[PDB]
Every structure is written in C-alpha cells, then in structure tokens.
C-alpha cells in the first residue's frame, strides 16, 4: 500500500506484522479538490 | 539432505528506501477506533489544489499596489518553484522535496480596493529564449489573459506548461534551460481612482500538475 | 592657555555621592550659579536611599552649594501596597542640562512598575524646572514596555537643549538596546503634564522608531549633541551609537525638524567610538563641526606596539555637505583621552571657538588631565595650549577629573568664557576662570644698522674723544577685549651684543653700559609709547671681532600682580606672541 | 475564470480557457503513505531513546512532511546500530523496565537490527501540535529577544508525554532510524521553503558531461 | 448577487432560540467534515448525554481594524472561551465535553473601504510564524472584503486526539483573523472598523458530572 517497488509478501500473520484496526459504530481533500469549479464562469464569446 | 542455496554477494545490505518490511517483535495489539476523523488527506497534491496560498512581493506582502505612472509592470518573475515570490507558497514548500515537476500552475488574483476603484490587469507568459516584455503592448504577442474588476473579485489564470522535455527541474543551478522556464509578467492596463489599492495573489496546482522523484536537500 | 590655575573655585559634596558626575552653568534673569550633579547623594525623600540630587552652587561670595528640590516625594503607589516606582539608587543628577530659566536633570536608573504586571523596568525619568514651575518628563515610561519596547530605555542617559527650546533625550536601551532618540518641545512637556497620568502623550514628539533585530544592542542615545547640518537654522540631532556596526561604533545625525536621517563610523573594534559627541563651529565659518570621542582607541608607536590612548575625530562641516575629518590621538596610555568633549566658545577671544578634551584617568596618580585646544582658520590646532591637572588622590573609585565638564559661559562677566570640571571620584567640582588676553605690538628699530667704525659722531662727556654712535628705539602698544585695566605697566629690558664671557662691542651712551632697563607704563587701546636712546660702538682697538653681527635684544615683562582685578584675576599675554624681539647691526670694512 | 473571491470554494482553471488541453498525470510520489515510508536519521541519546516521531529533524523529508499534518497515525519500523542487547518497552511503561530481558529484546547481530513496532498509544491518533495552554493568539506580544530566545524557542511548544512509541535502551546506541508504516494524516498545516536572498534560490545540481 | 453595488445574498442561521440574518453573504464554509463522527465511544461507557440548551450564539469583540495595521496583524481567539451562559456552566459541571463550532465574524464598514481580512479556524495553534501566515489558507477560511461582504461564516467539527476533551486544559480550535491588505479610508470609507465574532457550539455532548459545593 505504501512504499513498494517489490511485492515479497509476509511470512507472518497480519496479526503480528501490524496493529489491527477497529471499526466504531482521500476523504476530505480528495473530494474538495474534485469539487473544484473548473469551467469558465462568464458568457464565453468567440 | 537439505535445500541448497547460494548466498549471493551484493545483496541484502540495508537500503533506506527498500520495499521490505521488518520482522515483528510484539503481537496482537488493536488500535483505538479512528474511522471517519475529519480532515483526511491522502495525497499532498490534493491539498495543494484545494488550498491556494499567498505570493510574496517587494516588502514581504501578498499584494501588489496599483502604481500610477508611465510604468505598468506590477510583478515580473521567473516561472520557477524556486523563485522568491513563490517561496512562501505551499506549492513551493512541497516541491523542494522533489527534483522534477510537470503540468499547470494556477494564479489567483483577488482585487481588494473599494467599490468606486476600477482597474484592468493583464497577465502574460513569456517563454524562454528572449528577454521578457517591458510594456503591455509588447507582451500582447505572448499567451496572455486580461480582466477587469467588477462584481466577481477573483480571476484565475493557468500558467501553461510549455517545455521541450516532459519534465522540468524544481531547483535552479545556472542560466540553463531546465531552470528558467520563462517568465510570468503582470501588467496594469488601466485604472480609475484605484490609487494605493491592493491585488492580493494566491497560487496553487493545476489539474495536471505533477511532481515526482523525491529528494532531501535540506532546510524544511 | 588663559585659564586661571593659581586659585580656581573648588566645590565639594558628601563622600560617595559622586559630586561632579555632571556639571553645567545656570544663568537665569541677574545672578550666576553652578549646577553639579550628584547621582549618589542621599535625600530626605521618604524611604529612598541615595536618590541623587542636583546642587545649585552659589558662585557669588561664599562657596555654598544648596540642593535643588525637583521631587521631595517618595515612591508613589499603583494600588494599595503596590509601589509604582523605585527611586532608590535612581541616579538622579547623572545628567544635568540648563538653558536660561530651564533646568533639566534626569535619573537614568529610575525603575518603574508597569501598569499591568508587577515589574521593575528602568525607563528612566527627568524633572524639568522653569523658575517656579517643575514638571516630570518620562517619555520612555509608556505603554510600550519590556526590553523590546521602552522598558529598559533608561531615558535621560544623555540630554541636550536646542535653540528653538526643544529637548533632546537619549535612551540606549530601547528596543533591545537599539537605543532611541526622543525629542520634545519644552512647551508640551509642561503644557501636557499630568500628575495622575504616568504615560503622557506629547502631540509634537519626534522619535526614532524601532528597527530590525540586527540593530539590537547598539546603544543609540548614549551621548547627544545639537547643531545645524542641513542649513535651515534648526538644531539637528547628533548622537553616539558606540556598539553599532559590530562594536565598531557609529554616530547618527538626524534632522531636528522631522527626525530624518549623515552617519559616522569607527575604524577600530571596541574603541567605543561615540562615547561622547560635541557640536561646535571650530573654524569660524559658522558651520557646526562634529567632534566624536573614542577613549579606548589603540595607537601604534615607533616600536610598533599597540597602546590604548584614545581618539577624537574632528569632522569639519563643509558647505558641500561633506566633512573634513581629522583624527586627534591621546597622549597617555590607558588615560582614556576623549571621554569628555566640551565646546568652550571663544576661550581666548581671538575669533575662533575653542574646545576642551579630557583624559580623566591620566596624569600622576591617575588624578586626571584636561587638554585645551584652540580653533583657527584651518580647523582645530592639534597642539594643546594648556594642560589642566587634577590635584586630588584616589579613595576607591579614581578621582575622574574631567569625566564631565561644561564651558562656553562668561560667568564672571570678564568678556571671557569659563570652564567647570567635575571630579566625581573625589566628590569635587572645579571652576576655572579665563584671564583677559592682552595682545602687544612691541617694536625695535636700530638706525643706522650698518655702523661705520670711523664715523665718530656722538661726543662722549668726560673725554675729548668722540665715538661712533647710533640710535636704539623700542615701542610698546597693547589692547584687549573684555574687562581689563586701562593702564598697563611693563618692564622693558635691553641688551647690546646679546650674542656675546665675551666682550660686548656696543654700549649705551648716557650710562656706558650694555644693559638698560626701563619701567614703561602704557595704556590699553591708547597710543603707542616709544622711548629711544643712544648707543655707541667701542674703539676699533678694543676688540678683534668685527665680523660677528651685534645683536640688539629687547624683552618685556608685564606686572601681573598690579594688573589683577577685584578677585585677583590677572590678565595674560597672547600665545604665539613673542615676549621678546631682536634686531642686529653690522660693521663694514 | 472569474468567481467570488472569498467563497473559499476551490476554483481550478485549465489551459482549455485559452485553447489548450489538460494532460494526464501520475501522482504516486506525493501519496502520503508512499512518501512517508522511508528511513529518516534521528540523533540518538547515549542509552535511553524514547521513540517519539517529533524527535526527527524538521528540515528533513520525513520530518518536514510529517509536521505538515495536525494528527497522524502510523506503525513504526526501527533500525538501530547498538552495542549489547537492545530492549524495547511499550508506551506507558516505567523506565526500570528497560532493564528487564522479558521485554522485547534483540540480541546483537552485526551490523544493525531493524524491528517492526506497532502503535501502542492510548489515543486514536497522535499529534504534531497540541494546544495545551499556550499562544493567546494576538501577535505574541513583543517580548523575547536576545539570550533567552534560544530557550524561548521551545517554550510556546511542547507535547503530552503519551505521544510516543515507547523507548529503546542499549549499552551504547550508535545510530537510529525511523520508518513510518501505514501513514495516515489529517488536517494539513503550513510547509515552508528556503527563503532566497537573490531573486531566485540557486543551488548546485549534479553535472555530467553535456 | 445583484445588478448594482447594492447587494442581496440573504442567509439566516438559527442556533437554538437565536437567529442571525446577513444580506451580504458568500456562503458557509465547512471545514474538514460536513457531519459529525461517532459520539458514543468506548471511552465514556455510554454515559454521554447531549445538552441542547448550550447550542446557541454568543458574542465577543475581536479587535479594531485601523488603517495603520499592515499585513500580518493577527488576532487569536482560543475556543472555548470564557463563557457566562449555560455553555459556561458545563465546564464546571462535567469533566468531558466535545462540540463543533459555528463561527460568524463581522466587520461593518461601508463599501467604500479597501482592505481584506482573512478569518480562519486553525486546529491546535500552539505557535504562529510570520512566514506561516502566507499559508494560512490551508485551514477553513473566508475573506472579508469590504467591497463585497461584511460576514464570514465557518462551520467546523470536533477534532482531537481523543474522542472527548477536557476543555479546562486544552483548547482545540483557534479563531485567527489576519490583515492581508491594510484598511483604506479613501474619501467615503468608515474611518476604522470593529471586528466582532458571533460563535455558537454545535452537537455539544457532556459526560462525567463532578461534585458540587452548592
Ligand atoms: C654716522 O654717525 C651719525 C651719528 O650716529 C649717524 O647719524 C644718523 O643719520 C641718520 C640719517 O640722517 C639718522 O636717521 C634718522 O634721522 C634722519 C634725519 O637726520 C631721518 O631721515 C631718518 O629717517 C629715515 O631714516 C631711517 C633710518 O633707518 C631710514 O631707514 C629711512 O630711509 C629714512 O632715511 C632717521 O629718523 C640718524 O638718526 C642719525 N643718528 C645719529 C646718532 O646721529 C650717521 O647716519 C652715520 N653715518 C654713517 C657714516 O653711516
Ligand atoms: C629702570 C629700573 O630701575 N628698572 C627696574 C628693574 O630693574 C626692576 O626689576 C623693576 C622691578 O619692578 O623695577 C624697575
Ligand atoms: O516596503 C519595503 C520593506 O518591506 C519589508 C522588508 O522587505 C524591507 O526590507 C523593505 O524595506
Ligand atoms: O527577502 C528579500 C526581500 O525582503 C524584504 C525587503 O528587503 C525586500 O526589498 C527584499 O527584496
Ligand atoms: O517592510 C515594511 C516596512 O518597510 C519599511 C517601513 O516603511 C516600515 O514602516 C514598513 O513597515
Ligand atoms: Ca537642521
Ligand atoms: Ca565649521
Ligand atoms: Ca579661540
Ligand atoms: Ca571669565
């Protein structure tokens, strides 16, 4: 996911390599730059 | 017997940027939940596009005042991330860790003077190869855009990426091609009672702005 | 050279009070007084040890020095059980400046509690007195506090009056010791005064604003001087910045109308260029000339060894706007020549202003020395015409004779300005009076000057033989400015064949002697008195020496004891004026 | 393109506004996970080294880009050149623990030793800046310059002591390196470049033949 | 907006029983999130409660924007501030709180003034620098440009390393108002201009009631 120019995978279980995430119950600045008003705003002539 | 293996020479030394993970020492730790925290950004260039930051002019101010004389050159500076005007932008503080860029740089020009102050401005792009223009009439033969103040107080112009090669350097060495990408020249066509106003100017990254090949020179 | 040293006026104070750290003249409206600053003098102020006081010393008759009450109160309170100020050891009287009826004294080490948090910051303070009026003037005691502001300003470290009655004040600690020049007109200092307001705003205030951090610790306002430099009549502001330019020292000159920026710079590291400054027209061209002192300057001798001697830079103001800078070195090692520089006006009344420079830690037993330099057409005569010596020994802090001094004031109305010298190390202050200068037009004529040995004209009573005679004739004429006797008796001496144990070939006729004296009494401004007599040659067969010219010498001495006036101030004869002249006579063959 | 100046809405323009065409772009090198996944050198103490990421030089790549985010998450990877055995101890553990071998201890194997360390903070996310009780927010009232300013560098700043990944202790730790794994970042913050003295920050780039 | 210098962009905001109308509006800026995240967490044992009386505007003075103030002049307001309402009696009653902010800054001087203000909500503002002010638009912001508006409205959620906060020892948000172009009073402009804030907490949740000396 991060720094790879190779893909040798893991001897070990994910339960030992990293710390496991827990769910309770690209987000903001990717939607904010994608909602950027790109088009021209005036009444384009010529 | 057992499996024969040839331990090769030149392999296995620590490389500070190798795509390999270390060995675990301590297992079965669960993180506190952090799903849906506000403000997640995944790419440094997503924040450089959604958030323009100010330029820096003579006297260390983000604005350029309307001059009233035979001179009509407000700002005129090298199209370079290493420029002095760009030095306080987030786009140039983030480009100091890369050796090459490509794509479009947007400039945002927001006019500040009162409602009875009126002006007309002109931003042009001088490609490298000859000296930059000194009057608006000589710069009208470049790629330029011209706007004036009204109800809408911000105008955005996209510095086009013209170059011989697909990528250009973010640093500067000597008078050379890759480090001088031309100029960007701001002129004042007219003004009406706009004496001493301010035209604050921002800068951000374009749609196709790209920045590759990380490096660590110095000086955050 | 005309200063009285025989019996100069001595004044003293409490031991340890630093009596003489600052001195000035006080001329109101028709008695004359002396102002001595004693910044360590105990006062009767409630609970204030060594508040410091300024003493008005009566020059008339007795030698009484009555203290002056600018402030008799103690520490005012900000609130209940919360002192506002700290006048203890405030060094009041460290700088005293007077102009007519206005006396300005200051306390550089006066500390003040902020109007917010409980601090103790040396903003410094001053007290301005106009006859019956007396206000307080603390321009650095403001809302701008703590180091980066005016909190450590120590306003009043140096002060000066302009001709338009405007106060110039220096504070070396403003804005992290960048220093600050503050100028206020004496009108608003009293007019906008308010006993209940601690931070008074003055409408017409000129000040140097805060500058870049690289200008920190430069000490602007360390010393101050006034004079016009842009030719508009208004006195401009000259100030020493001794730590500026990486301890090379600078001197700033601002416009006295709007605090607009010339700038002098030093040649040696840590020579303290700007420790003292003075502005006086030294060459009679009515252009104020800049004097800058650097007591720590080191010079090299013929042995090529560095020695701290001190240096003063004499910058003559040209109409071109440029300066004609001349450097004058000290004389004794470690004497710190140039610590104090005092314009004297025209000390000898010759037509050009004069100036005094002191080496406070010079002379025998570190007593102190003051050098007197006379001005002329070309500029300042680099050779001192007089050397003033301290006469008091040390106790703990050296006598410091010459550490502060003031001149340019005709305090005795003799037509000649006088000089005060402060020796605070021994708590003394000394007034030197200027003796009247007498220019004298002496004359001597020998006719005929070519003597014919066989002439034999003048007969000689007693003998039938006649001798070869000739006439000797001397004249005196004297006059002087200021107050001085209209009668002047001199003692004239004449010698024939002055060149000769050897035989003198000429003698006077009506005495038969080569020597003749004449009590002569001429009048000041009156006509030239002239008495002549007959001298004769010896017989040809009385000497072989006929080739050597017979020199006729005339010498005169003034009776100083009888020329004295009232107090006993005896006049003096002009410098560079020959006290004796000589003509000669030849014999032919 | 004209627009409301103060809407704070992101307004992008393109080269189509005057006849160009926006080209495609590859942005893998500015990905937060990609770029923060390097070893960065840290100045180590003699024996004990609490593993805080704010100990990284701020002028570095990983140092400057980490401080460009208010809150962050990552697992940690450590490379250490040490003498004797190296002991690790999790977040919130006493110092006396650094002496006991039962804690994760890596015996000496030349030349160095790289360990994968998890996230052990009590917090859902760590912070590069934490407003405990500092700046009032009104131009820092002009106060400090001169000698104390070097001490005054660190006064306005600080951190709770739970923002760390534990400690390491060896007899003699010679070199230390951090590598951030699975880096997440939140709430971006300013990032400054070198301010040039000329009109442009020139530098010395590597020089081949032609 | 409108065809003339006159201006009609009406926007009303009701927090609780308190409204606020503006006719020179640019829109509300949402920072870092539009909604809230999960209030109920594993750290309060389900003992968190929502207090709806505390979600309403309170007013405060920021600074006088005079013509002598040049670029970079800041005013920092740490939130939550010293509050005398019912929201203030929550930091004396409960040990943990969390809330977003609804910030509305006002600068009334007629449209014949120049100058430009930048109001921004900055999280965890321990120290600001002179150069970092050039990148102050990385945060939820709006400009106040007297030729166009007088109001800047910025809504913003709860951020922190923890899900609930102890506001007596931590100020997560900071309202910074910066001069980006100095004020001008040309011929008809208002001589100075005062800057006011009209703040309101949102989604306030409290947990852990402390003892009382009452
Ligand atoms: C021989 O001895 C006698 C006696 O000693 C000498 O007598 C002298 O004659 C001088 C010329 O006459 C005489 O000069 C003064 O008196 C002059 C009138 O008699 C008068 O003209 C002179 O004024 C002028 O004189 C000065 C003198 O320096 C000249 O420089 C001018 O050019 C003018 O000529 C003098 O006032 C002198 O007084 C007189 N002395 C005596 C004692 O009799 C005589 O000269 C000798 N002559 C020889 C042989 O040399
Ligand atoms: C001509 C004559 O008698 N000369 C004398 C002189 O020798 C003496 O020195 C002086 C003292 O005042 O008085 C006269
Ligand atoms: O307005 C000019 C002023 O702006 C600020 C600094 O850059 C100064 O050096 C310059 O003198
Ligand atoms: O940083 C350089 C820049 O700083 C500020 C002023 O001194 C300007 O004139 C200068 O060009
Ligand atoms: O650099 C800005 C600065 O420039 C110089 C002076 O004009 C100051 O008054 C001003 O603040
Ligand atoms: Ca003048
Ligand atoms: Ca002169
Ligand atoms: Ca003289
Ligand atoms: Ca006299």
Residue numbers in the entry:
A (entry chain 4): 15 to 39, 65 to 85
B (entry chain 3): 1 to 220
C (entry chain A): 1 to 29, 32 to 263, 265 to 503, 506 to 594
D (entry chain 1): 1 to 210
E (entry chain 2): 5 to 218
Sentences reproduced from the published study:
FMDV, a small non-enveloped RNA virus (genus Aphthovirus, family Picornaviridae), exists as seven antigenically distinct serotypes and many variants and sub-types. Structures of several serotypes determined at near atomic resolution have revealed a capsid composed of 60 copies each of four structural proteins (VP1 to VP4). A prominent feature of this otherwise rather smooth capsid is an exposed flexible loop (∼30 residues) on VP1, termed the GH loop. This loop and the RGD motif embedded within it (residues 145–147 in the O serotype) comprise a major site of neutralization by the host humoral immune response and mediate FMDV binding integrin89101112.
For each virus the two well-resolved classes corresponded to distinct poses of the integrin, for PanAsia these were termed A and A′ and for O1M, A and B. The integrin portion for these complexes was resolved at 10.8 Å (pose A, 4.9% of sub-particles) and 11.5 Å (pose A′, 4.2% of sub-particles) for PanAsia and at 8.6 Å (pose A, 5.9% of sub-particles) and 12.3 Å (pose B, 6.7% of sub-particles) for O1M (resolution assessment uses the ‘gold standard' protocol). Integrin binding in pose A is very similar for both PanAsia and O1M; superposition of the integrin based on the virus structure shows <8° rotation between the two. In this conformation, the integrin molecule is almost perpendicular to the surface of the virus, as might be expected for initial engagement at the crowded cell surface. The VP1 GH loop, to which it attaches via interactions with the RGD motif and downstream hydrophobic residues, is extended up away from the virus surface. At this resolution the cryo-EM density for the integrin does not reveal detailed interactions; however, there is density consistent with the RGD in the FMDV GH loop binding at the interface of the αv and β6 integrin subunits. The D of the RGD appears to coordinate the MIDAS Mg2+ in the PanAsia complex and as expected the structure is similar in the O1M complex with Mn2+. Unexpectedly, in pose A, additional density was observed bridging the integrin to the virus surface (for both PanAsia and O1M). The quality of the density and lack of density in virus-only maps, rules out this being adventitious attachment of HS. The significance of this interaction remains unclear since both viruses examined are tissue culture adapted and therefore bear mutations in this region, and the glycosylation of the recombinant integrin (Man5GlcNAc2)29 may differ from that seen in the course of natural infection.
